Coordinates of C-alpha atoms and ligand atoms in Angstrom, one line a residue:
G12 CA -3.1 20.8 -7.9
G13 CA -6.0 18.7 -9.2
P14 CA -7.3 16.6 -12.0
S15 CA -8.5 17.8 -15.4
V16 CA -11.5 16.8 -17.6
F17 CA -11.8 16.5 -21.4
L18 CA -15.1 16.0 -23.2
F19 CA -15.0 15.0 -26.9
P20 CA -17.8 14.9 -29.5
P21 CA -18.9 12.0 -31.7
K22 CA -17.1 11.6 -35.0
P23 CA -18.9 13.7 -37.6
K24 CA -19.9 10.7 -39.9
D25 CA -21.3 8.9 -36.9
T26 CA -23.8 11.7 -36.4
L27 CA -24.9 11.8 -40.1
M28 CA -25.7 8.1 -40.7
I29 CA -28.6 6.7 -38.7
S30 CA -27.0 3.3 -39.1
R31 CA -24.0 4.4 -36.9
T32 CA -23.8 4.9 -33.1
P33 CA -22.5 8.4 -32.1
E34 CA -21.0 8.6 -28.7
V35 CA -19.6 11.4 -26.5
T36 CA -16.4 10.7 -24.5
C37 CA -15.5 12.1 -21.1
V38 CA -11.8 11.6 -20.2
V39 CA -10.3 12.4 -16.8
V40 CA -6.5 12.7 -16.5
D41 CA -4.2 13.7 -13.7
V42 CA -5.9 11.4 -11.1
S43 CA -3.6 11.0 -8.0
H44 CA -3.2 7.6 -6.3
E45 CA -3.9 9.5 -3.0
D46 CA -7.5 10.1 -3.9
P47 CA -8.0 7.8 -6.9
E48 CA -11.8 7.5 -6.8
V49 CA -13.8 9.0 -9.7
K50 CA -17.6 9.3 -10.1
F51 CA -19.3 10.2 -13.4
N52 CA -22.6 11.9 -13.6
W53 CA -24.2 12.4 -17.1
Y54 CA -27.0 14.7 -18.0
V55 CA -28.9 15.3 -21.2
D56 CA -30.5 18.8 -21.1
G57 CA -30.1 18.9 -17.4
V58 CA -31.6 15.4 -16.8
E59 CA -29.5 12.7 -15.3
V60 CA -29.1 9.7 -17.5
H61 CA -27.8 6.3 -16.5
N62 CA -26.6 4.3 -19.5
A63 CA -23.0 5.5 -19.7
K64 CA -20.4 2.8 -20.0
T65 CA -17.4 3.7 -17.8
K66 CA -14.1 1.9 -18.3
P67 CA -12.1 0.7 -15.3
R68 CA -9.2 3.1 -14.5
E69 CA -5.8 2.7 -16.2
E70 CA -2.5 3.9 -14.8
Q71 CA -0.3 6.1 -17.0
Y72 CA 3.5 6.0 -17.4
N73 CA 3.7 9.3 -15.4
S74 CA 2.1 7.8 -12.3
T75 CA -1.4 9.2 -12.8
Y76 CA -4.7 7.4 -13.4
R77 CA -6.7 7.9 -16.6
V78 CA -10.5 7.2 -16.4
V79 CA -12.8 7.2 -19.4
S80 CA -16.6 7.2 -19.6
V81 CA -18.6 6.8 -22.8
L82 CA -22.2 7.9 -23.3
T83 CA -24.0 6.8 -26.5
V84 CA -26.2 9.5 -28.0
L85 CA -29.3 9.1 -30.2
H86 CA -28.8 10.3 -33.8
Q87 CA -31.9 12.6 -33.4
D88 CA -31.0 14.0 -30.0
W89 CA -27.5 15.1 -31.2
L90 CA -28.9 16.7 -34.3
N91 CA -31.7 18.4 -32.3
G92 CA -29.1 20.2 -30.2
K93 CA -29.4 18.4 -26.9
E94 CA -26.5 19.2 -24.7
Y95 CA -24.5 16.6 -22.8
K96 CA -23.0 17.2 -19.4
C97 CA -20.3 15.2 -17.8
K98 CA -19.8 15.8 -14.1
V99 CA -16.6 14.5 -12.6
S100 CA -16.3 14.1 -8.8
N101 CA -13.1 13.2 -6.9
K102 CA -11.9 13.8 -3.4
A103 CA -9.0 16.0 -4.5
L104 CA -11.3 18.7 -6.0
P105 CA -12.9 21.5 -4.1
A106 CA -16.1 21.2 -6.2
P107 CA -17.0 18.7 -8.9
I108 CA -15.9 19.5 -12.5
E109 CA -18.7 20.2 -15.1
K110 CA -18.1 20.0 -18.9
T111 CA -20.9 20.4 -21.4
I112 CA -20.9 19.7 -25.1
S113 CA -23.4 19.7 -28.1
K114 CA -23.4 19.8 -31.8
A115 CA -22.1 23.1 -33.3
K116 CA -24.9 25.7 -32.9
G117 CA -26.3 28.0 -35.5
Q118 CA -29.1 28.1 -38.1
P119 CA -28.4 25.2 -40.5
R120 CA -27.7 25.9 -44.2
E121 CA -27.9 23.3 -46.9
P122 CA -24.8 22.9 -49.1
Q123 CA -24.9 23.6 -52.8
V124 CA -22.8 20.8 -54.5
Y125 CA -21.2 21.5 -57.9
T126 CA -18.9 19.3 -60.0
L127 CA -16.3 21.0 -62.3
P128 CA -14.5 19.1 -65.1
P129 CA -10.7 19.4 -65.7
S130 CA -9.4 22.7 -66.9
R131 CA -8.6 22.8 -70.6
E132 CA -5.0 23.6 -69.9
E133 CA -4.8 20.5 -67.7
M134 CA -5.7 18.2 -70.7
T135 CA -2.0 17.9 -71.5
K136 CA -1.3 15.8 -68.4
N137 CA -1.4 12.1 -67.9
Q138 CA -3.7 12.7 -64.8
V139 CA -6.5 15.2 -64.5
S140 CA -8.4 16.9 -61.6
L141 CA -12.1 16.5 -61.0
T142 CA -13.4 19.2 -58.7
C143 CA -16.3 19.1 -56.2
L144 CA -17.3 22.5 -55.0
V145 CA -19.5 22.4 -51.8
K146 CA -20.6 25.8 -50.7
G147 CA -23.1 27.6 -48.5
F148 CA -23.3 25.1 -45.7
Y149 CA -23.7 25.6 -42.0
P150 CA -22.4 24.2 -39.7
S151 CA -18.9 23.1 -40.8
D152 CA -19.2 19.4 -39.9
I153 CA -19.2 17.6 -43.3
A154 CA -17.9 14.5 -45.1
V155 CA -17.0 14.1 -48.8
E156 CA -16.2 11.0 -50.8
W157 CA -15.9 10.1 -54.5
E158 CA -17.2 7.0 -56.3
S159 CA -17.3 5.4 -59.7
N160 CA -20.0 2.8 -60.5
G161 CA -20.0 0.9 -57.2
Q162 CA -16.5 1.3 -55.8
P163 CA -15.0 4.2 -53.9
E164 CA -12.4 6.4 -55.7
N165 CA -9.9 7.0 -53.0
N166 CA -7.1 9.1 -54.8
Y167 CA -8.8 12.3 -53.7
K168 CA -8.1 15.1 -51.2
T169 CA -10.5 17.6 -49.6
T170 CA -9.8 21.0 -48.2
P171 CA -10.9 21.8 -44.7
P172 CA -14.1 24.0 -44.6
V173 CA -13.4 27.7 -45.2
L174 CA -15.5 30.4 -43.6
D175 CA -17.1 32.4 -46.5
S176 CA -17.9 36.0 -46.4
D177 CA -21.6 35.4 -45.7
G178 CA -21.0 33.3 -42.6
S179 CA -21.5 30.0 -44.4
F180 CA -18.7 27.6 -45.2
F181 CA -17.3 26.1 -48.4
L182 CA -14.7 23.5 -49.4
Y183 CA -13.4 21.8 -52.5
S184 CA -12.6 18.1 -53.1
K185 CA -10.1 17.2 -55.8
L186 CA -10.3 13.7 -57.4
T187 CA -7.3 12.7 -59.5
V188 CA -7.8 10.1 -62.2
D189 CA -5.9 8.8 -65.2
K190 CA -6.7 11.0 -68.2
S191 CA -7.7 7.8 -70.0
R192 CA -10.5 7.0 -67.5
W193 CA -12.0 10.5 -67.9
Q194 CA -11.9 10.2 -71.7
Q195 CA -13.4 6.7 -71.7
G196 CA -16.6 8.5 -70.6
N197 CA -16.7 7.0 -67.1
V198 CA -19.1 8.5 -64.5
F199 CA -17.5 10.0 -61.4
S200 CA -19.7 11.0 -58.4
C201 CA -19.0 13.4 -55.5
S202 CA -21.0 12.4 -52.5
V203 CA -21.5 14.7 -49.5
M204 CA -22.9 14.1 -46.1
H205 CA -24.2 17.1 -44.1
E206 CA -26.9 17.5 -41.5
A207 CA -29.0 20.0 -43.6
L208 CA -29.4 17.8 -46.6
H209 CA -32.4 15.5 -47.0
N210 CA -31.4 12.3 -45.1
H211 CA -28.1 14.2 -44.6
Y212 CA -26.8 13.0 -48.0
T213 CA -26.5 14.0 -51.6
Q214 CA -24.4 13.1 -54.6
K215 CA -23.6 14.9 -57.8
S216 CA -22.0 13.3 -60.9
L217 CA -19.4 14.3 -63.4
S218 CA -18.7 12.9 -66.9
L219 CA -17.1 14.1 -70.2
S220 CA -19.9 15.7 -72.4
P221 CA -19.1 15.0 -76.1
Ligands
LIG301 C1 0.1 11.9 -17.8 O1 -0.2 11.1 -19.0 C2 -1.5 11.3 -19.5 C3 -1.7 10.4 -20.7 O2 -0.6 9.5 -20.8 C4 0.1 10.0 -21.9 O3 -0.2 9.4 -23.2 C5 0.2 10.3 -24.2 C6 -0.9 11.4 -24.3 C7 1.7 10.9 -24.0 O4 1.7 12.2 -24.6 C8 2.3 10.9 -22.5 O5 1.9 12.2 -21.9 C9 1.7 9.8 -21.7 O6 2.2 8.6 -22.2 C10 -1.7 12.8 -19.9 O7 -3.0 13.0 -20.4 C11 -3.1 14.0 -21.3 O8 -3.4 15.3 -20.7 C12 -3.5 16.4 -21.6 C13 -3.7 17.6 -20.8 O9 -2.5 17.9 -20.1 C14 -4.6 16.1 -22.6 O10 -4.4 17.2 -23.6 C15 -5.7 17.5 -24.2 O11 -5.8 16.8 -25.4 C16 -6.9 17.1 -26.3 C17 -6.8 16.3 -27.5 O12 -6.8 15.0 -27.0 C18 -7.1 14.1 -28.1 O13 -6.0 14.0 -29.0 C19 -4.7 13.6 -28.4 C20 -3.7 13.5 -29.5 O14 -3.6 14.7 -30.2 C21 -4.8 12.2 -27.7 O15 -3.7 12.0 -27.0 C22 -6.1 12.2 -26.8 O16 -6.3 10.8 -26.4 C23 -7.3 12.7 -27.5 O17 -7.6 11.8 -28.5 C24 -9.0 12.0 -28.8 O18 -9.7 11.2 -27.9 C25 -11.2 11.2 -28.1 C26 -11.7 10.4 -27.0 O19 -11.2 9.0 -27.1 C27 -11.5 10.7 -29.5 O20 -12.9 10.9 -29.8 C28 -13.5 9.6 -29.8 O21 -13.0 8.8 -30.8 C29 -13.5 7.4 -30.8 C30 -12.7 6.6 -31.8 O22 -11.3 6.8 -31.5 C31 -15.0 7.5 -31.1 O23 -15.1 8.2 -32.3 C32 -15.8 8.3 -30.1 O24 -17.1 8.5 -30.7 C33 -15.2 9.7 -30.0 O25 -15.9 10.4 -28.9 C34 -10.6 11.4 -30.6 O26 -10.8 10.9 -31.8 C35 -9.2 11.4 -30.2 N1 -8.3 12.0 -31.1 C36 -7.2 11.5 -31.6 C37 -6.5 12.4 -32.6 O27 -6.8 10.4 -31.2 C38 -6.9 18.6 -26.6 O28 -8.1 18.9 -27.3 C39 -6.8 19.4 -25.4 O29 -6.7 20.8 -25.8 C40 -7.3 21.6 -24.7 O30 -6.3 22.2 -23.9 C41 -5.3 23.0 -24.5 C42 -4.6 23.8 -23.3 O31 -5.1 23.1 -22.1 C43 -5.8 24.0 -25.6 O32 -5.3 23.6 -26.9 C44 -7.4 24.1 -25.7 O33 -7.8 25.1 -24.8 C45 -8.1 22.7 -25.4 O34 -9.2 22.9 -24.6 C46 -10.5 22.5 -25.0 O35 -10.8 23.3 -26.0 C47 -12.1 23.8 -26.1 C48 -12.3 24.4 -27.5 O36 -11.1 25.1 -27.9 C49 -12.3 24.8 -25.0 O37 -13.7 25.0 -24.7 C50 -11.6 24.4 -23.7 O38 -10.4 25.1 -23.4 C51 -11.2 22.9 -23.7 N2 -12.4 22.0 -23.3 C52 -12.5 20.7 -23.5 C53 -13.8 20.1 -22.9 O39 -11.7 20.0 -24.1 C54 -5.6 19.0 -24.5 O40 -4.5 19.3 -25.3 C55 -4.4 14.8 -23.3 O41 -5.5 14.4 -24.1 C56 -4.2 13.7 -22.3 N3 -3.9 12.4 -23.0 C57 -4.8 11.4 -23.0 C58 -4.3 10.1 -23.7 O42 -5.8 11.4 -22.4 C59 -1.5 13.7 -18.6 O43 -1.6 15.0 -18.9 C60 -0.1 13.4 -18.1 N4 0.1 14.2 -16.9 C61 1.4 14.6 -16.5 C62 1.4 15.5 -15.3 O44 2.4 14.2 -17.1
LIG302 ZN1 -30.5 8.7 -11.6
LIG303 ZN1 -26.2 6.2 -12.7
LIG304 ZN1 -29.3 11.8 -26.9
LIG305 ZN1 -26.7 12.5 -34.8
LIG306 ZN1 -26.5 18.3 -29.8
LIG307 ZN1 -25.0 24.5 -22.0
LIG308 ZN1 -19.1 5.5 -47.8
LIG309 ZN1 -32.7 20.4 -49.5
LIG310 ZN1 -37.6 11.9 -47.1
LIG311 ZN1 -31.3 12.0 -39.4

């Protein structure tokens, strides 16, 4: 029938750290050998731009060609809602294919970050759960990590964002540590990246209070 276009956003962390390079990815699949030519046009807010890096086509094991084009986006443009259009032209199509993407839309809402110590009843266990509540944020793109003086604490798991009853999102992150480390008074820190925080970052700390 005709080829199909997919347009993918940057990775969320790449949009929240100015040191990183967010990029948007236009993928064309189902390109026939009969008309194998593929032209990309990129627009930012309706204005054609020219810095996209297209990859040379690559044949698939199902006898179709796959062509990829990558446009780097500016940290501030993406956060300011600019919209990115990929236009794919190929002989086999009646009219060119237009896909548009941007950051999740909606008024931004800054998260409230709260650490919760292990439950009393959980103090019987050889491991305990440190809880980071992140609530009230909009949009849902977010990243959460845990640290203890310098090094990342990676035995943690974070729930997906959940739509709350006021239209904002919340989640929880659970860090599991040896009960000894928690009682040795060590400081544990939940750090949160989200667009609506100052510099898109905050951290909150948790320690035994005796
Ligand atoms: C012939 O073969 C080719 C490929 O060869 C095959 O290789 C694999 C795939 C084998 O399975 C086998 O087939 C062959 O060996 C086939 O090509 C495939 O075609 C199908 C369509 O038929 C495509 O399906 C869509 O996939 C989307 C998800 O794709 C991602 O995830 C899958 C794995 O789950 C991967 O396979 C893909 O490569 C994609 O991976 C993502 O790619 C991004 C770009 O690289 C990554 O982002 C980038 O990441 C880098 C670092 O890695 C940087 O961070 C960059 O900054 C960043 O931009 C991303 O991380 C990566 N993810 C992963 C996990 O790797 C689906 O989203 C899509 O769903 C759409 O369609 C469904 C129904 O059609 C439905 O669920 C939805 O409606 C959805 O539609 C979109 O949804 C939105 C919102 O809901 C709506 O608005 C729209 O409806 C719609 N719009 C848009 C714009 O999307 C499809 O399921 C498949 O991806 C593609 N494969 C490849 C490799 O390209 C071909 O079909 C075969 N043909 C025949 C006839 O056999
Ligand atoms: Zn031009
Ligand atoms: Zn050009
Ligand atoms: Zn931009
Ligand atoms: Zn950005
Ligand atoms: Zn945007
Ligand atoms: Zn649009
Ligand atoms: Zn980090
Ligand atoms: Zn603030
Ligand atoms: Zn400042
Ligand atoms: Zn910024």
